[PDB]
Amino acid sequence: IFLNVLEAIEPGVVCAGHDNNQPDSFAALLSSLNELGERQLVHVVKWAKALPGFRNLHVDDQMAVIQYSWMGLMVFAMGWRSFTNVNSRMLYFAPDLVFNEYRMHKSRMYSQCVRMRHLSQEFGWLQITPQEFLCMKALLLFSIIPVDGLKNQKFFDELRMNYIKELDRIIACKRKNPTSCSRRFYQLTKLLDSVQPIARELHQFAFDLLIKSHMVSVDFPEMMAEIISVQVPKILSGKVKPIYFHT
Ligand SMILES: C[C@]12CCC(=O)C[C@H]1CC[C@@H]1[C@@H]2CC[C@]2(C)[C@@H](O)CC[C@@H]12
Incomplete structure (x- = not known):
């Protein structure tokens, strides 16, 4: 029954609404990623809540858990979309927002994208x-x-x-x-x-970008600005940390 649920509640395709006719500019790519962020956040919230035994958690913990794990959940799923759709060649953020080497570099996020592409491969390896x-x-x-x-x-x-x-x-x-x-x-x-x-490298990255976001023409949608300035800092300041199997 457990597997039926996960399969049943798996969100579908989410587009980022990225204009692909426009040139790949740092502000263009990150704004689309940000918007994609707001869009997937909505889905993850509806997915998590329909998870087996999720209501067993206290109300603000239901929310807490979500606001802390969203970066990890999204990268993992993205890594997975990359594996199925394109054999981990490029990063499959969304059907209209696929990152290639140019984009990767042209996002000032090259190194982090290498790790994620590296993750997508593990799904295959x-x-x-x-x-x-x-x-x-x-x-x-x-x-x-x-x-x-x-x-x-x-x-x-x-x-x-x-x-x-x-x-x-x-x-x-x-x-x-x-x-x-x-x-x-x-x-x-x-x-x-x-x-x-x-997820930590992205957490720090999203944070710096937000602080000087309007200095680079990078738009952050409502939900994203809130979580990055309210929840991510707690992770980065060490108040909330990930549970590791090996340690
Ligand atoms: C979670 C998202 C958006 C959803 C997704 O599929 C991948 C992913 C990984 C990079 C994140 C991005 C949202 C916007 C962020 C947080 C940018 O500010 C910097 C890194 C971006």
């Missing part, structure tokens, strides 16, 4: 399964919290453990078998850990 992808993605929502804990840390802990057990079950139940029930787990949890450092 490991032959990651659509069912594993979904579970992994779900687990990402419960992978970053305040060091002083949430309102009801207990419920969150119950919720996080169960999701881990599921990622473990779709690695055991008949389908691909292989006693590799361990090697496969070490690797996925290893892949899961790797989205975090990538």
Whole structure:
């Protein structure tokens, strides 16, 4: 039943509304990414809330969890769109916002894009399964919290453990078998850990851009400006940190 839900609640295609007739300018690319950000945020919020056992979390923790994991969730899904649609050649942000080397450099985000392209490849280098992808993605929502804990840390802990057990079950139940029930787990949890450092580089980047955003003609939609100035700082200042499997 768990896999039915994830498959059933998987959001669809989200376009960024990017004008591809216009030249690839830093402000153009980042504004489109920003807008894409506002657009996917809406979806992620509706996805997370329809997640199994999500309502078991306290109200502001439901929101907290979302406002802290959104960067990680979106990159992971983006990495995945890149794998299916284009074999991780280029980064598939949206059908109308595909980044190539030029764009990557022409976004002043080259290095970060290398890491994400690198992630998309892992989906291939490991032959990651659509069912594993979904579970992994779900687990990402419960992978970053305040060091002083949430309102009801207990419920969150119950919720996080169960999701881990599921990622473990779709690695055991008949389908691909292989006693590799361990090697496969070490690797996925290893892949899961790797989205975090990538998400941090983007967190810092989004932040600096926002501070001097109007100095570079870069528009930040409402929701995005709020979360980057209110929630991301807590991550960057160390108040909220990611949960790592390996450490
Ligand atoms: C989450 C988004 C938007 C949704 C997506 O598919 C990928 C992705 C990764 C880069 C983020 C971007 C939103 C806008 C940000 C945060 C920019 O300010 C700098 C990095 C961008």
